[PDB]
Amino acid sequence: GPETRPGIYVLTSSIAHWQTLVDVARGKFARERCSFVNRRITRPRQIP
Amino acid sequence: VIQHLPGYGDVLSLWSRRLLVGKLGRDVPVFVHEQQ
Amino acid sequence: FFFPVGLYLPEDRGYTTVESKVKLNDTVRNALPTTAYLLNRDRAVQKIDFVDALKTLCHPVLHEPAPCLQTFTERGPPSEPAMQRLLECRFQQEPMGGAARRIPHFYRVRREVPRTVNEMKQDFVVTDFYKVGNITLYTELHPFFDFTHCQENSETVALCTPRIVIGNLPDGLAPGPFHELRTWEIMEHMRLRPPPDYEETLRLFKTTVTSPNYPELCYLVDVLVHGNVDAFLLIRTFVARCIVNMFHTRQLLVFAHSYALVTLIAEHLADGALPPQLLFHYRNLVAVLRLVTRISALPGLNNGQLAEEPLSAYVNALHDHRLWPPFVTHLPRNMEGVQVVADRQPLNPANIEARHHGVSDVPRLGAMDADEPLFVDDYRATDDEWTLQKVFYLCLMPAMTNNRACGLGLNLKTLLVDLFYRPAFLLMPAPEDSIAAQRQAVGEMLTELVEDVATDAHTPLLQACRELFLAVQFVGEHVKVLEVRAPLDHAQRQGLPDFISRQHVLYNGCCVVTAPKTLIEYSLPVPFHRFYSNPTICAALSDDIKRYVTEFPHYHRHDGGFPLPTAFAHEYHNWLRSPFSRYSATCPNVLHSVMTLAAMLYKISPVSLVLQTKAHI
Amino acid sequence: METHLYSDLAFEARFADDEQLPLHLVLDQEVLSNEEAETLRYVYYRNVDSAGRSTGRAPGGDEDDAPASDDAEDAVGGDRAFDRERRTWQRACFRVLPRPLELLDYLRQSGLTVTLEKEQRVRMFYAVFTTLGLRCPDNRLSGAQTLHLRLVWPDGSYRDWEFLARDLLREEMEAN
Amino acid sequence: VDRWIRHAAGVERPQLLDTETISMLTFGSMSERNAAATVHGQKAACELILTPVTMDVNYFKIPNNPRGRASCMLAVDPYDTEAATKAIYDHREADAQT
Amino acid sequence: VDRWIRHAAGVERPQLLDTETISMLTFGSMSERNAAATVHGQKAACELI
Amino acid sequence: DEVARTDEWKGAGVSRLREVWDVQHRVRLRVLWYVNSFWRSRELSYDDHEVELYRALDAYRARIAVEYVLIRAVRDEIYAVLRRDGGALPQRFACHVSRNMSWRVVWELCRHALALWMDWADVRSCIIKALTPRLSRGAAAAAQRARRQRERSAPKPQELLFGPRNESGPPAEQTWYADVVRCVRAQVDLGVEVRAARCPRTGLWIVRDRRGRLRRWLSQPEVCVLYVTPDLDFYWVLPGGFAVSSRVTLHGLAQRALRDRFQNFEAVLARGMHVEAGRQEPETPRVSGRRLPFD
Amino acid sequence: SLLHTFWRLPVAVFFEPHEENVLRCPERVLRRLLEDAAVTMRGGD
Amino acid sequence: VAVFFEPHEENVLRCPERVLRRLLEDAAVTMRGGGWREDVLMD
Amino acid sequence: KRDEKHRHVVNVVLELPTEISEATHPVLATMLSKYTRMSSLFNDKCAFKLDLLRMVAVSRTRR
């Protein structure tokens, strides 16, 4: 969007090891990651 | 050119979007029934 | 616990252990069961029908034979010699251009042909099919697919194909009378339980199509018209005279062999010019086609479309544009997946050139012997007429004629010149002399063709033969054997997506029932299908086929086991294959067997299962 | 879909150094069967000069031009010649859609606003997306150039066929 | 056609399985949810296998193996796996039962 | 005709060797192997007149 | 504030679609053109002078030429060595022979087989499969090792008594690729693979399938069969195990085109295949549509 | 025309035809084979 | 009982002169005909 | 000139009997205006004969 409004979630999972949880979070949140890269390119004077 | 218009009786809208994003390089969609 | 649903006890052994306690209505629903009833936790009766079975029958895994093919390949070809004599079989893909010219060249070799596994599977009666004495049983792995071994490059590999229509099932798995009873079930659901009494027209059709005394010129005009409406309009007055004279001189109905002639007569000659009884016979034949068309679909439940294709096409193969009639004279208006093969590669749209009459168009007449270019009328067959032609050729003909028909072509380029090129035809104003002078001037062969077939006191022989001559402007070309290559519908594709169905049709030719003796010198035969491959006609027409048949007297069988030329013999990739020839060999000559061949066509697709099951069929 | 965009950007990057322009392809059931389209592993492409050459070899000539020796020891210059042959082949990105689809509807469901010269529907039982390059030694591009397309499957089998650049560019370049 | 089939039978849309690690962590998915009400007992899972229309009806009036050939392992000789597989699969032999 | 009738009947050829056949005629031998499995009793083969 | 190339790319879209056939008209495929492509901005020029086109088609003819001319060289060797021997064929493949047979008819069948095989020549034939492993990198090293190993003095008693055991020699089981042609019905088989061995009693050859079963065709009067060794040695056989011997003179071709047409293409690592050389590959990747794709 | 055999005296054949190869030649069958092959070869600028 | 010659490396099959002449004449005709398959494909 | 070519196309290709001439058939002359165009196809004379035959048929219809 034009400016960043944040998303909030509380989630339950059976995964304990951190990197596996980060892997699954990346898998489900790929749109947000691509949006972050898009923010980095589209407004170079700003650094999220 | 226009399929549906409010009170009248969208290829034009998306085509204008493509031409205007080619020109501007900014995402401001101007639909036929949205802006003036 | 385990319990059966919808079994079918043999009718050879019908018996009633109880008669005094129970008696049922004579509806075929009681004759052929389709439900099972079981007791609940407490003594209450519950109903299980195939509609509840649909939750599992329609699941994709049942229609996925890939692991079955893998384990079949790993099990390998059986080694015992009894299996070995069944094992040997060979197929070859061939170009289609020379396929019509080379038939005598193929038949000249005195070699036998091994019977395919599916053909061998039919011979056993049902109660012997399960016994260990059956060799071919190991191949019967799945109800919806065939499995077989084949040889190419001197190695043995496994081949798989899908049973496009339920009729494909082997005789031991579903006996012939069972199909009759399911046809009765279809009729009772459609509430046509007493069939419309077209029976006398069917008896006359039987006696006229099986008669060896069929007039020879019937094939010539059938080639000449092509079924083109304007061509038939010119001859229409000749047709009426010929038909009335033939019916009076012989009680056999003329011009009944070809669908185009039948339907063109039924519409156009209805204007008049005929004794009403013969026109009634033809309209009754067309009505039989319409009735069996109504039986083919499920009009009560049939509604909607899927993937821009009609649900009827999913239900029954008679509505698929992917199934062509064995004899074709007009290209269908619908072609999406179908590829038409005239030579080594499928035809691009540019190669299909338009045939326009009147104008000289000489290079086409020069290149009639050619293979690559395919000539069409500036015309297409509508889908309803497509269905009617398909059902007339596949359904009615081999049922009523007991598979005695055959395909032949006429050598038009020399035949029409040798017939008409007398100066009597070339000089004609924009007769009356004497019969001897007329016969001398017209040409003796045309005389023996026409002498008493199409002349009356109102029109002597010369006027009639000039009348037939006038239509020559629609001459056409020689015969060709076309290959139709198509993948199945979007649902049947799911199992074996790579699979391609290969089918053969004959273009610009006749379906005949007897040898034209005068035309024997000019004509050539071409047996090409599991139908229309009677060896008697072929042995009569060509010396090489007679030599081949007299070397192997057993092959004389009318039941479709007669070896086709190897370019045609792709039995596993045809839609129709072995059961319909074997059934046509024994079936009685009544309307019921005709309609049975059509109801037997129902497709195996899961969507077809859904539609059939919802009807409770 | 993403393969076309990524390959376009990558060829934009590499054009300044090796001068290849990108060509975008889509293939359907007339090309390859569903089984081999489902298990597709590698796609390879090559360019040829008009007189008959390759992109990797020295344009003037090479020792490979010599006749085969049919000797026992080195059949055809084994290691060096095989290295050259693998050098001349080039790899490209690919994505395959195994589900059946039609081009125009799929593109409109994507961000691309397709507006063809006519809305010709095409139905493909399975689709693979691929981008290939054809090189021009300078900004002069010759229509007589031939292009190679190779497909590779895990078991080592391969199929290939050649195109004429004049057919691919028959009207698109004629406008420019 | 997939959607049309999913509508024809009262079955829900397809659902991906859990991955290897999650499958090892969690002991089962129990896809078929518990029904709202049940007066009769536990829903008897009725499975269907395909059968020719002309099977011998006498097959059912006796206690029987519902896969055509009997395969009781007290019949074959012990530990002769080749002979056991011959008895259960090798179709050219004369089978047990009828 | 012997080959064809043997195939149609479902019984194998006389694969027997010379020393085993002379022993089989004079002594007798187990020329039939055991069946794969038996849920019923001995193969009490019927004799047909 | 500016957008990335991706968004203006997707907005601009495509507008053209063309269908193109390959040179042989075997396969047809489509091409897409994107209006926003940098290819448009470059403004390069295009021309197709006819002499370049003629050169291109002549070179293409020379490219497809590689295998048919090799078949014809095989023909030339067969006829030349038949003339050189003068009509004498020694027996080479183990099978019995009958004297009171009309050998003229089997000679005529050999003529017919020779005529029929050549009409059905194709890249699928045996000799292409024979050259297939010869071109790979391992072939040169293997040939070098084999020549060094076979050209060796008998070990002294010293070497036999101490140290390494007798160094392994070549196995009898050889691999051949073959064409077989049947004349009784005019049809050919061209992509056969066959096992071979030398009979211990007499030095003739025995032919077997990869399943181990002994092969039958050598007896059949109507068949003549073609063999080629993995070291490009050549045999033609007619019924009775009588053979013609020559070496495939492949020197008629330039190495460039011969390597260009075909080779056993070596792989590079992709998802799922082992990093260590020669390990057993896991289940195939197979991005599939029969199943819901994994994510 | 007749071949030259190494062994001065021939030997009796035995064993089934799948462990050693022997050719058998009915003269009538061979004549039919020759005629059929010759015809079909022709059958198949 | 039938009789056969045992195969050996030395026994040789003769060729009649007329058949060899026919083969050589066919070889010459095929060589000078120029019926190359590649030319058919290019045509 | 034209006489030799027309004599060929009349008496060798089409092989009309001498009693049929140009003055007897207008359609035949209007067709020979076309037939002389192509110098090939002078071996499959049956095609030309059938073409003239069907041309007469189409010329004589009352529609």
mmCIF file of C-alpha atoms in Angstrom, chain D residues 41-176:
data_model
loop_
_atom_site.group_PDB
_atom_site.id
_atom_site.type_symbol
_atom_site.label_atom_id
_atom_site.label_comp_id
_atom_site.label_asym_id
_atom_site.label_seq_id
_atom_site.Cartn_x
_atom_site.Cartn_y
_atom_site.Cartn_z
ATOM 1 C CA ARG D 41 14.218 -31.505 -16.365
ATOM 2 C CA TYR D 42 16.350 -29.420 -18.741
ATOM 3 C CA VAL D 43 15.900 -27.199 -21.788
ATOM 4 C CA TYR D 44 18.809 -26.155 -24.005
ATOM 5 C CA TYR D 45 19.191 -23.788 -26.951
ATOM 6 C CA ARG D 46 21.877 -22.855 -29.476
ATOM 7 C CA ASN D 47 22.407 -20.384 -32.322
ATOM 8 C CA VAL D 48 24.031 -21.042 -35.705
ATOM 9 C CA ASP D 49 25.644 -18.710 -38.227
ATOM 10 C CA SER D 50 24.284 -18.630 -41.771
ATOM 11 C CA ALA D 51 27.212 -20.577 -43.255
ATOM 12 C CA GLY D 52 27.020 -23.098 -40.394
ATOM 13 C CA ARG D 53 28.844 -22.464 -37.115
ATOM 14 C CA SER D 54 28.189 -22.316 -33.366
ATOM 15 C CA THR D 55 28.255 -19.691 -30.625
ATOM 16 C CA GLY D 56 31.034 -21.260 -28.550
ATOM 17 C CA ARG D 57 33.519 -22.261 -31.236
ATOM 18 C CA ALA D 58 35.936 -19.763 -32.739
ATOM 19 C CA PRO D 59 34.029 -18.289 -35.721
ATOM 20 C CA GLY D 60 36.861 -18.644 -38.238
ATOM 21 C CA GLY D 61 37.407 -22.362 -37.754
ATOM 22 C CA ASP D 62 38.524 -25.111 -35.430
ATOM 23 C CA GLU D 63 40.432 -28.390 -35.380
ATOM 24 C CA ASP D 64 37.038 -30.119 -35.123
ATOM 25 C CA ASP D 65 36.577 -29.388 -38.841
ATOM 26 C CA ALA D 66 39.080 -32.165 -39.638
ATOM 27 C CA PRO D 67 37.782 -35.576 -40.784
ATOM 28 C CA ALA D 68 37.102 -38.233 -38.173
ATOM 29 C CA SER D 69 40.092 -40.496 -37.627
ATOM 30 C CA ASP D 70 38.272 -43.779 -36.703
ATOM 31 C CA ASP D 71 41.377 -44.786 -34.716
ATOM 32 C CA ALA D 72 41.266 -47.030 -31.659
ATOM 33 C CA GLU D 73 42.608 -44.535 -29.116
ATOM 34 C CA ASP D 74 40.756 -41.221 -29.542
ATOM 35 C CA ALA D 75 37.627 -41.652 -31.649
ATOM 36 C CA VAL D 76 36.841 -37.932 -31.915
ATOM 37 C CA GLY D 77 39.129 -35.779 -29.739
ATOM 38 C CA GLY D 78 37.342 -37.093 -26.711
ATOM 39 C CA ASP D 79 37.818 -34.768 -23.755
ATOM 40 C CA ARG D 80 38.521 -31.457 -25.511
ATOM 41 C CA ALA D 81 35.866 -31.932 -28.200
ATOM 42 C CA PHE D 82 33.243 -33.023 -25.659
ATOM 43 C CA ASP D 83 34.114 -29.990 -23.531
ATOM 44 C CA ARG D 84 33.635 -27.763 -26.584
ATOM 45 C CA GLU D 85 30.290 -29.397 -27.406
ATOM 46 C CA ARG D 86 28.991 -28.923 -23.868
ATOM 47 C CA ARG D 87 30.357 -25.366 -24.035
ATOM 48 C CA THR D 88 28.314 -24.489 -27.118
ATOM 49 C CA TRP D 89 25.006 -25.544 -25.527
ATOM 50 C CA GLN D 90 23.284 -22.992 -23.288
ATOM 51 C CA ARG D 91 20.612 -23.440 -20.621
ATOM 52 C CA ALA D 92 17.437 -21.420 -20.061
ATOM 53 C CA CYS D 93 14.816 -21.186 -17.331
ATOM 54 C CA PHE D 94 11.511 -23.037 -17.642
ATOM 55 C CA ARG D 95 8.208 -23.468 -15.824
ATOM 56 C CA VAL D 96 5.575 -26.096 -16.630
ATOM 57 C CA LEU D 97 1.859 -25.921 -15.869
ATOM 58 C CA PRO D 98 0.561 -29.515 -15.716
ATOM 59 C CA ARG D 99 -3.088 -28.538 -15.343
ATOM 60 C CA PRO D 100 -4.933 -27.767 -18.596
ATOM 61 C CA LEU D 101 -5.596 -24.121 -19.357
ATOM 62 C CA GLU D 102 -6.306 -21.585 -22.081
ATOM 63 C CA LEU D 103 -3.775 -18.838 -22.757
ATOM 64 C CA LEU D 104 -5.949 -15.717 -22.751
ATOM 65 C CA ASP D 105 -7.925 -16.527 -19.597
ATOM 66 C CA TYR D 106 -4.759 -17.501 -17.720
ATOM 67 C CA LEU D 107 -2.954 -14.317 -18.767
ATOM 68 C CA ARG D 108 -5.923 -12.178 -17.727
ATOM 69 C CA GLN D 109 -6.022 -13.966 -14.365
ATOM 70 C CA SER D 110 -2.377 -12.918 -14.159
ATOM 71 C CA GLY D 111 -1.475 -9.233 -14.341
ATOM 72 C CA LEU D 112 -0.995 -9.217 -18.116
ATOM 73 C CA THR D 113 -3.733 -7.310 -19.976
ATOM 74 C CA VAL D 114 -3.649 -9.297 -23.204
ATOM 75 C CA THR D 115 -5.213 -7.564 -26.233
ATOM 76 C CA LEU D 116 -4.510 -9.755 -29.267
ATOM 77 C CA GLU D 117 -5.251 -8.898 -32.885
ATOM 78 C CA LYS D 118 -8.200 -11.252 -32.437
ATOM 79 C CA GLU D 119 -9.337 -13.063 -29.305
ATOM 80 C CA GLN D 120 -8.365 -16.471 -30.703
ATOM 81 C CA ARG D 121 -9.017 -19.061 -28.007
ATOM 82 C CA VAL D 122 -6.378 -21.774 -27.676
ATOM 83 C CA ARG D 123 -6.805 -24.841 -25.470
ATOM 84 C CA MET D 124 -3.692 -26.620 -24.204
ATOM 85 C CA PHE D 125 -4.010 -29.796 -22.143
ATOM 86 C CA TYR D 126 -0.661 -28.921 -20.521
ATOM 87 C CA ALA D 127 1.662 -25.954 -20.915
ATOM 88 C CA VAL D 128 5.368 -25.298 -20.394
ATOM 89 C CA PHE D 129 6.849 -21.790 -20.428
ATOM 90 C CA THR D 130 10.328 -21.187 -21.812
ATOM 91 C CA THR D 131 12.472 -18.292 -23.020
ATOM 92 C CA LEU D 132 15.273 -18.692 -25.564
ATOM 93 C CA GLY D 133 17.877 -16.365 -27.027
ATOM 94 C CA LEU D 134 19.152 -15.752 -30.536
ATOM 95 C CA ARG D 135 22.368 -13.790 -30.954
ATOM 96 C CA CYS D 136 23.221 -11.004 -33.383
ATOM 97 C CA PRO D 137 26.968 -10.232 -33.674
ATOM 98 C CA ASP D 138 26.008 -6.555 -33.830
ATOM 99 C CA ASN D 139 22.660 -4.778 -34.140
ATOM 100 C CA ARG D 140 22.316 -6.474 -37.544
ATOM 101 C CA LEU D 141 20.158 -9.600 -37.210
ATOM 102 C CA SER D 142 20.133 -12.069 -40.112
ATOM 103 C CA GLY D 143 16.967 -14.007 -40.920
ATOM 104 C CA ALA D 144 18.915 -16.991 -42.275
ATOM 105 C CA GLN D 145 20.089 -17.834 -38.742
ATOM 106 C CA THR D 146 18.888 -21.175 -37.387
ATOM 107 C CA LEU D 147 17.957 -21.861 -33.767
ATOM 108 C CA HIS D 148 18.094 -25.110 -31.791
ATOM 109 C CA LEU D 149 15.752 -26.255 -29.018
ATOM 110 C CA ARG D 150 16.754 -29.227 -26.855
ATOM 111 C CA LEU D 151 14.746 -30.951 -24.130
ATOM 112 C CA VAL D 152 16.358 -33.341 -21.646
ATOM 113 C CA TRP D 153 14.770 -35.976 -19.400
ATOM 114 C CA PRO D 154 16.393 -37.720 -16.398
ATOM 115 C CA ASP D 155 17.079 -41.020 -18.199
ATOM 116 C CA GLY D 156 19.294 -39.230 -20.745
ATOM 117 C CA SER D 157 16.858 -39.299 -23.664
ATOM 118 C CA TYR D 158 16.476 -36.074 -25.624
ATOM 119 C CA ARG D 159 14.566 -34.611 -28.561
ATOM 120 C CA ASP D 160 15.402 -31.542 -30.622
ATOM 121 C CA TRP D 161 14.320 -29.630 -33.719
ATOM 122 C CA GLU D 162 15.460 -26.527 -35.573
ATOM 123 C CA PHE D 163 13.829 -23.223 -36.515
ATOM 124 C CA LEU D 164 14.509 -20.548 -39.112
ATOM 125 C CA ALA D 165 14.738 -17.046 -37.654
ATOM 126 C CA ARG D 166 12.842 -15.706 -40.674
ATOM 127 C CA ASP D 167 9.786 -17.726 -39.601
ATOM 128 C CA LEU D 168 9.908 -16.606 -35.958
ATOM 129 C CA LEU D 169 10.436 -12.933 -36.870
ATOM 130 C CA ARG D 170 8.340 -12.986 -40.066
ATOM 131 C CA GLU D 171 6.129 -10.012 -39.155
ATOM 132 C CA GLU D 172 7.072 -8.740 -35.687
ATOM 133 C CA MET D 173 10.451 -7.479 -36.894
ATOM 134 C CA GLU D 174 9.011 -6.416 -40.263
ATOM 135 C CA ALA D 175 6.993 -3.735 -38.458
ATOM 136 C CA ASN D 176 10.198 -2.332 -36.943
#
